[PDB]
Amino acid sequence: QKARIKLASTNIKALNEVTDQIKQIAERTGVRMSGPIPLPTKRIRITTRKSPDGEGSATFDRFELRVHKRLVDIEADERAMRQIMRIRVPEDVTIEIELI
Amino acid sequence: RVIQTAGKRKTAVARATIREGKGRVRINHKPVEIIEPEIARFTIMEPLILAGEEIVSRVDIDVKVEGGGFMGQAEAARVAIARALVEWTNDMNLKEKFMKYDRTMLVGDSRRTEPHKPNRSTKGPRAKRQKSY
């Protein structure tokens, strides 16, 4: 049995935190791991016009939101699952887990 | 033995493989001798003519190219082929000949596009709409 964890966030530090934590919890115990795997970064761009009126040359405002993603497979051993679900994850990170 | 190699050009990557053989060269499943057009065929054949006869008569080459137009593909392929020939033959004579002829054979180009700016975004970064006065 294997378990696959997907992580997304606007901050790289939280991702590195979670990765290090689960990597160490899996290493101190005997479990073959996978990753960390980087997926491409998702960028939401929005180009708008500055002026609230019409007059004036057109100067445009380009905003961007980058979102970094990570993937892991952990092999879902006896205690690994129950000791990994007991993690202290910040609320700026989206973590999901799927059993294959 | 086998030697693998790569080559780049604007939005285009080529992977090449070389070994012992008869003299065949395929670019993406079709022989070089029937590549079209001629302006893209001479580009790929130049190094095989420079190297000579007794060198290419005893190598079989293969190339797989992906991305960016027939000219980009042909140049990436010529680059890969030249690098592989040199790696396989170990001749500074061949190296100096190629570099005299054209140094981009072995030192690829390093030019991509430039982003666009907001007056005529489709046309380009420095083309602008026409003023009136």
Partner: protein, 214 residues
């Protein structure tokens, strides 16, 4: 229709386009000798390099220079032959494929007619279309004169090639004649000193005005 033995050509030696030699050529004009590149090559294509370096115009093959001067769309905001030649969608702009084919058919006709080497013919044409003199406006005490000034061997070539390509573009505007055939006629005339050459005409006109203002 071209035969297959010409549609699928494979060069066996290092010659211009794999067909014509470049060592038997000669130049007797020392002012231009070092600016006419006659290096043994096959494909005369430089992908823009040698352009941002000031004197990079001396490491490019005259054939590629002629090709890039052939990549034309008539003449805009000035007039040649008595007309604006504006095309805007039917022009070979950024089409070296078509320019290459044109120059190829041209050199074919030249070799077929003259019984000589088209590159040697082109060299003699460029010589006989290279102007040695021009005019300019110099100022002293706050007035404008008109003086005659010598021209440099790097600009002579530019004007020669430009005028040849203009004559080609002119002899082909809305007439049954083709671009390649007109280019061949222009080159032959420039080499043989026939007033039918836009290029020789312009040269003699320039030198005439300059000798007058001398």
């Amino acid at each position: 229709a071209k035969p297959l033995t010409e549609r699928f050509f494979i060069p066996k030696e290092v010659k211009v386009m794999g067909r014509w030699s470049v060592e038997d050529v000669t130049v007797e004009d020392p002012s231009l000798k070092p600016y006419i590149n006659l290096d043994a090559r096959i494909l005369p294509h430089s992908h823009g390099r040698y352009a941002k370096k000031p004197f990079g115009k001396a490491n490019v093959h005259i054939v590629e220079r002629l090709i890039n001067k052939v990549m034309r769309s008539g003449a805009s905001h000035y007039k040649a032959g008595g007309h604006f030649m504006r095309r805007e969608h039917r022009s070979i702009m950024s089409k070296k494929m078509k320019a290459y084919e044109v120059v190829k058919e041209a050199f074919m006709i030249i070799e077929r007619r003259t019984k000589q080497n088209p590159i040697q013919v082109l060299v003699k044409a460029i010589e006989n279309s290279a102007p040695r003199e021009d005019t300019t406006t110099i100022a002293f005490g706050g007035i404008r004169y008109h003086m005659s000034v010598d021209v440099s061997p790097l600009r002579r070539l530019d004007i020669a090639l430009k005028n040849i390509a203009l004559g080609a573009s002119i002899k082909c505007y809305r007439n049954k004649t083709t671009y390649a055939q007109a280019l061949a006629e222009e080159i032959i005339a420039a080499a043989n000193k026939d007033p039918k050459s836009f290029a020789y005409s312009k040269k003699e006109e320039i030198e005439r005005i300059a000798q007058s203002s001398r």
